[PDB]
Every structure is written in C-alpha cells, then in structure tokens.
Design an enzyme around this catalytic site. Sequence first.
Site, short mmCIF file in Angstrom:
data_model
loop_
_atom_site.label_atom_id
_atom_site.label_comp_id
_atom_site.label_asym_id
_atom_site.label_seq_id
_atom_site.Cartn_x
_atom_site.Cartn_y
_atom_site.Cartn_z
N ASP A 88 5.09 43.54 21.75
CA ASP A 88 4.32 43.35 20.54
C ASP A 88 2.90 43.90 20.78
O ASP A 88 1.96 43.13 21.07
CB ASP A 88 4.26 41.87 20.18
N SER A 185 -2.98 36.56 14.51
CA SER A 185 -2.09 37.55 15.12
C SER A 185 -2.76 38.89 15.29
O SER A 185 -3.47 39.33 14.39
CB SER A 185 -0.83 37.72 14.28
C1 LIG Z 1 8.76 31.62 15.93
C2 LIG Z 1 8.07 32.91 15.46
C3 LIG Z 1 9.08 34.03 15.18
O1 LIG Z 1 9.22 34.43 14.02
N1 LIG Z 1 9.79 34.59 16.20
C4 LIG Z 1 10.80 35.60 15.85
C5 LIG Z 1 10.61 36.85 16.72
O2 LIG Z 1 10.62 36.43 18.09
C6 LIG Z 1 9.51 35.60 18.41
C7 LIG Z 1 9.66 34.30 17.62
N2 LIG Z 1 7.17 32.63 14.32
C8 LIG Z 1 7.46 31.81 13.15
C9 LIG Z 1 6.52 32.45 12.12
C10 LIG Z 1 5.29 32.77 12.98
N3 LIG Z 1 4.32 33.65 12.34
S1 LIG Z 1 2.88 33.01 11.92
O3 LIG Z 1 3.11 32.08 10.85
O4 LIG Z 1 2.02 34.14 11.77
C11 LIG Z 1 2.25 32.04 13.22
N4 LIG Z 1 2.41 30.75 13.25
N5 LIG Z 1 1.87 30.26 14.40
C12 LIG Z 1 1.38 31.39 15.06
C13 LIG Z 1 0.72 31.39 16.40
C14 LIG Z 1 0.37 30.18 17.01
C15 LIG Z 1 -0.21 30.44 18.28
C16 LIG Z 1 -0.24 31.83 18.52
CL1 LIG Z 1 -0.83 32.53 19.98
S2 LIG Z 1 0.40 32.81 17.29
N6 LIG Z 1 1.67 32.53 14.33
C17 LIG Z 1 5.94 33.15 14.30
O5 LIG Z 1 5.53 33.81 15.22
#
Ligand SMILES: C[C@@H](C(=O)N1CCOCC1)N1CC[C@H](NS(=O)(=O)c2n[nH]c(-c3ccc(Cl)s3)n2)C1=O
Lengths: 234, 52
Positions: A88, A185
């Site tokens: 990524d 992100s």
């Molecule tokens: C679980 C993960 C997700 O979609 N994955 C699929 C691809 O392989 C990795 C895991 N996921 C759910 C939605 C989420 N996107 S988000 O809403 O932008 C987000 N939520 N929490 C976070 C972060 C918390 C701490 C960090 Cl560092 S990034 N990003 C995210 O990464």
Amino acid sequence: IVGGQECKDGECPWQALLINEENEGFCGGTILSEFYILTAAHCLYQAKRFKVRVGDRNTEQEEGGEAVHEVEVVIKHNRFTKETYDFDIAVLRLKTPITFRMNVAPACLPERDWAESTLMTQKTGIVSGFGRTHEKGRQSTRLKMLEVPYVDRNSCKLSSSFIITQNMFCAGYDTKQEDACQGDSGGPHVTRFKDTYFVTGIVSWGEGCARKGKYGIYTKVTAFLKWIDRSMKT
Amino acid sequence: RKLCSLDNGDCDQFCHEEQNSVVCSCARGYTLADNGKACIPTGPYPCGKQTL
Ligand SMILES: C[C@@H](C(=O)N1CCOCC1)N1CC[C@H](NS(=O)(=O)c2n[nH]c(-c3ccc(Cl)s3)n2)C1=O
Ligand SMILES: [Ca+2]
C-alpha cells in the site's frame, strides 16, 4: 486522529492533504522533496481527480502559507492489492515544485538498516492527519498528531482478523482511546531521532478506530526505500 | 554494546560499522561535519526539521 493533540505552528510541516474536486480532504501524504509526495496506493481509488494541499493546519481559515499543487505523475506500486492492502504505497510527482516555508518542509528518508535497528526500535513514532476524531464522526478541520507506540510484531498478528504482511507494521494502543482513523490514510508515520523526524510509515488500515485489542496498520516504509528512490529518479 | 550500538556511535544520523569502526553519514540536504559525526543542513528547510 482519535485523541492526541493539534499540530501547533510548524510542528507537522511534512503533512500533505489529498483533496478532491469539492476541495474536501480524503487522504494524507508526506512531503518527500519539492516535487514528491509519499501516500498510500489505496488512496488513489478514493477520488477520480485530486490535487495536493500543503501548509494547511486549519481547513476553515486561510493562514497565508497553504498551496494547492496539481499532480503530474501518479506512481502506484505495481503489486498493490485491495484484498489485503499489501504494497500500500504510491509516490506523486507534482507539476510545480513545493516552496518550503513555515509549515511546509520535507520529512527525511532514512537508510533501511539504520532505520530498522534505530528508528523502529524506539518506543514510539508520530502519526498525523485531518481524519476523523472518532470512529463515527466527521473529518477534523484541524491538523492533528499523536504519539503511537510501536507494537510487538507477534502481538499484532494475534490481534488482527486480517493478514499482517512483512510490508506492514503495527502501532497504537491496546485499550487507550488514541489511534489514526478514516481520512488519515496515506499520511505520515514519522520517527524522531535527535530532533530529526524520519519517514517510517504510511497510514494504511485498521479495524475501526481505537478499538480495544486493535492497533493501527502502517505500510513499512523501510521495505520500499529503494523503490521510493527509483520512483523519484524519474 | 559497541560501535553503532553504543549511543548510535556518537553519530547525529546514520551509523554504519565498517572494518570494526563507526562511520557516520547524513540524509540528503545535510553535510557531515569535520568531526565526522554531526550533520549540518546545506540550506534552508532541511528535511526532518520542524519549522519553528
Ligand atoms: C479492515 C480494513 C479493510 O478494508 N481491509 C481490506 C483490505 O485488507 C486490509 C483490511 N478497513 C475497513 C475500512 C477501513 N477504511 S477506513 O474507514 O478508512 C479506516 N478505518 N480505520 C482506519 C485506520 C485506523 C488506524 C489506521 Cl493506522 S488506519 N482506516 C479499513 O482499512
Ligand atoms: Ca487553512
């Protein structure tokens, strides 16, 4: 950022903000040089056309130092996969060079071995961004930062419902309510050494924000240092 | 703890052990000082420095 503090004047000068057509921030980035921005590859699929904003700490005010830059070249890692978010990482070449000033300056790229034995073995790193202040909230209008402890690699794999590859590391807290979050992100994870801040991570993913038994997942910049180097050479 | 493991070999930034001795180096935009340990910014807005 859930918890943490506001970046005060001049504290997070390497922060970039990817903004969509509506001028709304959707991802972060790290200033690497006058022409290059480091970000996450998954951020590329979050907007059709986007520009890069720098020098901004408060998206509601205009404090003179902000500047929008068009993207000339998008360089996404060819191995990026939406399935696991492995690889990524992306680098952006801007059309016009960034002017460094208060709140606008690059973070340092470290050498791999020294970074792994010296930076990633420190107690903490710093993540920052304009992401949500709570799992269910809205983006922050203020740039925030948060010290996040490095997390034992075994502990991290055990906590996760998703695979943690060697191109990833974990940072954050088991139970405390502090973590990167949605909108953060692509943004910087930096590690301080003798008052110099080195790029060590890119905000990548997490199961929600600041959950109990869950940590933040970051791209391991030390795994892509030659790749970054090559990407900036052309 | 010897060489680079002992307080980063007294280096400001990067440390490498070479032929049983410490060798310091610096990030782009810094030059290694005469003592071969400190890192001096070549210009304004060196990488890694908060703008204060
Ligand atoms: C679980 C993960 C997700 O979609 N994955 C699929 C691809 O392989 C990795 C895991 N996921 C759910 C939605 C989420 N996107 S988000 O809403 O932008 C987000 N939520 N929490 C976070 C972060 C918390 C701490 C960090 Cl560092 S990034 N990003 C995210 O990464
Ligand atoms: Ca502003």
